[PDB]
């Protein structure tokens, strides 16, 4: 009788726990939900990725 959802069953990283996403989207999620408690260097890397990813998606590509 729907006490719980099967998305509470899944045990993994706190940000993507019953949530699919893209690459860029995933990164964004990570930055918001965790960011503040991330290792400086890693945070920077993430930011860079986001910057890159956005550019790749929103500009570079085919079918635009």
């Amino acid at each position: 009788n729907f006490e719980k959802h099967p998305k509470e069953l899944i045990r993994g990283p706190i940000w993507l726990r019953g949530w699919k996403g893209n690459e860029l989207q995933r990164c964004i999620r990570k930055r918001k939900m965790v960011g503040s408690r991330m290792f400086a260097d890693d945070l920077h890397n993430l930011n860079k990725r986001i910057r890159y990813l956005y550019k790749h998606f929103n500009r570079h590509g085919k079918f635009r």
Binding site: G21, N22, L24, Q25, I28, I50, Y54, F57, N58, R64
Partner: protein
């Protein structure tokens, strides 16, 4: 046109399109003609009349417009006394 936004990761809308056009629920996009309020002294009555009419859009153009907006603008609306309401649904079609 921003396929993935930076904060949400959604499609954004080209707001110019929104400003300029009307999306009827059938699929058709309505536009006002260009030069409809410019140099009317030199324009002849018939021409003026033509300019003042609300013209439909093409297939390709329509597609482009659709691409440029998001599924919010395509939704069914039920405004109180919209002058265009009757044109959203389309009747009597056959290929």
């Amino acid at each position: 046109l921003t396929y993935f936004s930076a904060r949400k990761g959604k499609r954004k809308t080209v707001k110019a399109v929104i400003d300029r056009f009307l999306r009827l629920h059938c699929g058709l996009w309505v536009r006002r003609k260009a030069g409809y309020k410019k140099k009317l002294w030199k324009k002849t009555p018939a021409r003026k009349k033509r300019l003042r009419e609300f013209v439909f859009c093409n297939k390709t153009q329509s597609k482009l417009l659709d691409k440029m907006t998001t599924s919010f603008w395509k939704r069914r609306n039920w405004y109180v006394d919209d002058p265009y309401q009757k044109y959203h649904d389309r009747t009597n079609l056959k290929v």
